[PDB]
Design an enzyme around this catalytic site. Structure first.
Site, mmCIF file in Angstrom:
data_model
loop_
_atom_site.group_PDB
_atom_site.id
_atom_site.type_symbol
_atom_site.label_atom_id
_atom_site.label_comp_id
_atom_site.label_asym_id
_atom_site.label_seq_id
_atom_site.Cartn_x
_atom_site.Cartn_y
_atom_site.Cartn_z
ATOM 1 C CG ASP A 430 -1.369 1.054 2.033
ATOM 2 O OD1 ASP A 430 -2.517 1.497 1.539
ATOM 3 O OD2 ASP A 430 -0.688 1.595 2.646
ATOM 4 C CD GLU A 483 -1.764 3.189 -3.065
ATOM 5 O OE1 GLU A 483 -1.791 2.888 -1.854
ATOM 6 O OE2 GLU A 483 -1.627 4.139 -3.656
HETATM 7 MG MG LIG Z 1 -3.631 5.416 0.287
#
Ligand SMILES: [Mg+2]
Ligand SMILES: [Mg+2]
Ligand SMILES: [Mg+2]
Ligand SMILES: [Mg+2]
Length: 755
Positions: A430, A483
């Site tokens: 993330d 991400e």
């Molecule tokens: Mg975020």
């Protein structure tokens, strides 16, 4: 070697097989060394030594007996290798069982760790059951180079460490062997810093920990607690390219999927433990164990037809409300859900059911909790000392010093550790931007540029490249998913091409375009057709994963139904059209728990999902819709073989904005596997709508999101349509379709249909 020595091994007469098995130096050359690796592999016909970090592989030869193998290799250092073992028609890849002949740190271990290249450092740092001086016990070792003293405190000494003072080696690592204790020992390190201040730390490399909010580490006999059964899964994984397979991920937060009753014990794999209550505010509820999740989540996912489960971070973390993203025990699965062997059982059962496991992994920061890695030895040891690069002030957390060898080694060995010891199939990282930028979330004059005057965090980029290089070398076949929310280039491209080395990237732009589009009242979507089509313009720059994640159904954003305009029927229809579009658009798929049954409320990490909704038809029908869509996805090659090639997609027409209709082809290796996808994103039905198609013949209505069993109105083409020889959309043939309201059709030519 002699036949006498070989037979001593075969017949278990040898006094110490580590003298002969494993890796042994034979001689030194001018610029290289000659080594032999030996293995006794009963039932193997063939074996190889893989040197994955050098991209080499050498056969082993039988020597004196068909199951005793040797391999001679010339190289300056032979620190990193695996054995590939073939037993009949099957191959496995393992670390050498005779790699480490003592539990203590060697000179070579310390040298490799000092350079940051000890890929198996977790075999020697932490706590390990073993034998020294002929006595069984536990060996402890911890990196704390500026500590004045370190002592092992625990249950065994009533938390008084005076007779268990550690010994400092090479001015860097403290060690101690404690006889006659073993697995289940509860302990901490008691450190005195350079100022004389005494304090207590959990083991950085601990394999198990008390239940939050207690923080003692617990000794684990990690290689002798679980018997795996997943060799065939692991072989198929190694020998396959996941980019060319269906990848449909069910994203799960283990703490909040389903809760049990705190009035009973938490069952474990062959045992039980006290229940872990979810909160003082909801005290009748407890977490489920990894064992119970294997028994319940896994068949649930298998029945739904997902290929993979992705877990929010399971590394040990002190606060439920972080969702796992603030980790303090990097080397242990959280004890909220039981023991290490219970999570091993979970992964093994996923593999038995043909389901892969992806872990969210959190290398980007760590919180300041006193038990954890912060200011570890009385200096900024894991974190950088300069807060302009060593703190994420808006988050209140600390940033690893990625350029410091021992810190890089802690993290790189940690990602490998989960693949090695827990058999996982992928990781997701993330907020990769948090690592990549020296000015991340920082005000002007509160960060400094890199040595070249830029904002790139050079040491972090190097670290990420190293992780992905190693991961794919040691474990080919995995998923490494990022991400990254700033348009950094080549995230999901090979490191040798200047990429970061991930193999998938979340398409955040797509997710925003989609969710913003479907939130628009349908009459107005004609002004926003671009949201439908735009993400294909940059699509081939990365290998995209289409993710609708947990982050999108919290903090006032609503759950999926609530995002949609209109009456109840229309909200459900919008969800089915969006997800049918998602599953037919190029890219892999991820969706979060609760999205598959139409939970109305936002995800609440402090309660469990609203399972009672599945008593009611509309929720049952939407869950049947996802079950069928995931089945179709695995059944239709054109939905997965060519996601990342131009061949695999082409728009038929995307100009009809005033009716919010788009259409496209998906293709695969066989032309007869091509699919025609038609989307109607308003509730206006169309009785006759012509769509260009490339071949004559009968196009079966393979899927229709308005089918009545999915809660739709049951409008459509009653099985399919013959194409007309009527040129349309620049194609020689065309179908005159009925388009149901707020729905997607998938059609497929049946070249065997009888006219
Ligand atoms: Mg975020
Ligand atoms: Mg004391
Ligand atoms: Mg716009
Ligand atoms: Mg509940």
């Amino acid at each position: 070697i002699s036949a006498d020595q070989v037979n001593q091994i075969i017949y278990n007469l040898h006094h110490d097989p580590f003298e002969i098995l494993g890796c042994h130096l034979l001689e030194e050359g001018k610029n290289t060394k000659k080594w032999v690796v030996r293995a006794y592999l009963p039932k193997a016909e063939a074996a190889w030594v893989i040197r994955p970090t050098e991209r080499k592989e050498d056969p082993m030869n039988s020597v004196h007996h068909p199951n005793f193998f040797e391999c001679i290799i010339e190289t300056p250092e032979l620190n990193h290798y695996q054995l590939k073992v073939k037993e009949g028609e099957h191959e496995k890849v393992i670390y050498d069982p005779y790699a480490f002949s003592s539990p203590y740190l060697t000179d070579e271990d310390i040298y490799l760790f000092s350079e940051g290249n000890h890929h198996r450092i977790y075999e020697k740092l932490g706590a390990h059951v073993g034998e020294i001086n002929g006595v069984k016990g536990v060996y402890f070792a911890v990196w704390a180079p500026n500590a004045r003293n370190v002592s092992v405190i625990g249950d065994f000494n009533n938390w008084d460490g005076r007779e268990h003072q550690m010994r400092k080696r090479n001015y860097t690592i403290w060690e101690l062997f404690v006889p006659e204790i073993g697995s289940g020992t509860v302990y901490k390190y008691e450190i005195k810093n350079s100022e004389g201040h005494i304090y207590e730390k959990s083991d950085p490399y601990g394999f198990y920990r008390e239940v939050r909010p207690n923080t003692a580490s617990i000794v684990v006999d990690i290689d002798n607690i679980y018997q795996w059964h997943d060799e065939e899964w692991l072989e198929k994984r190694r020998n396959s390219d996941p980019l060319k397979q269906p990848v449909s991920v069910y994203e799960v937060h283990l703490g909040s999927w389903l809760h049990g009753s705190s009035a009973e014990k938490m069952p474990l794999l062959n045992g039980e433990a006290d229940p872990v209550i979810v909160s003082e505010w909801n005290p009748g509820a407890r977490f489920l164990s990894y064992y119970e999740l294997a028994e319940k989540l896994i068949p649930y996912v298998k029945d739904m037809g997902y290929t993979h489960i992705e877990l929010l971070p399971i590394a040990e973390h002190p606060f439920d409300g972080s969702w796992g993203y603030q980790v303090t025990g990097f080397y242990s699965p959280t004890s909220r859900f039981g023991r290490p062997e219970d999570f091993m059982y979970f992964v093994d059962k996923c593999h038995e059911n043909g389901i892969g496991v992806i872990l969210d992994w959190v290398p980007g920061h760590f919180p300041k909790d006193s038990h954890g890695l912060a200011y570890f030895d009385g200096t900024h040891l894991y974190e950088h000392a300069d807060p302009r690069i060593g703190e994420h002030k808006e988050w209140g957390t600390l940033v690893f010093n990625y350029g410091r060898h021992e810190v890089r080694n802690f993290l790189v060995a940690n990602v490998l550790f989960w693949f090695d010891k827990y058999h996982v199939d992928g990781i997701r990282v993330d907020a990769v931007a948090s690592m990549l930028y020296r000015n991340y979330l920082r005000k002007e004059g509160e960060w400094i540029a890199n040595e070249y005057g830029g904002d790139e965090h050079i040491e972090a980029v190097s670290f990420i490249r190293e992780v992905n290089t190693l991961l794919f070398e040691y474990f080919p076949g995995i998923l490494s998913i990022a991400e990254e929310s700033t348009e950094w280039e080549k995230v999901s491209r090979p490191v040798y091409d200047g990429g970061l080395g991930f193999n998938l990237k979340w398409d955040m732009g797509w997710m925003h375009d989609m969710l913003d589009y479907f939130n628009i009242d349908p009459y107005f979507r004609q002004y926003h057709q671009n949201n439908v089509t735009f993400s294909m313009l940059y699509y081939y720059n990365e290998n995209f994963m289409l993710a609708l994640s947990h982050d999108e159904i919290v903090h006032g954003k609503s759950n999926m139904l609530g995002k949609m305009p209109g009456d109840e029927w229309q909200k459900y229809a919008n969800v089915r059209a969006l997800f049918t579009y998602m599953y037919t658009h190029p890219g892999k798929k991820t969706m979060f728990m609760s999205m598959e049954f139409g939970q109305w409320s936002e995800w609440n990490v402090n309660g469990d999902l609203e399972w009672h909704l599945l008593q009611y038809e509309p929720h049952q029908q939407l869950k049947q819709f996802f079950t069928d869509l995931n089945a179709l996805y695995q059944q239709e090659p054109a939905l997965y073989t060519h996601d990342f090639e131009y061949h695999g997609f082409e728009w038929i027409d995307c100009n009809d904005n005033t009716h919010s209709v788009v259409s496209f082809l998906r293709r695969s290796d066989d032309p007869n596997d091509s699919l025609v996808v038609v989307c109607n994103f308003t509730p206006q039905p169309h009785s006759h709508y012509r769509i260009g198609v490339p071949e004559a013949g009968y196009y079966v209505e393979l899927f229709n999101s308005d089918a009545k069993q999915y809660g739709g109105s049951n409008m459509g083409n009653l099985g399919g349509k013959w194409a007309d020889e009527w040129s349309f959309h620049n194609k020689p043939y065309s179908l005159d379709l009925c388009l149901p309201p707020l729905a997607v059709l998938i059609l497929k030519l049946d070249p065997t249909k009888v006219p």
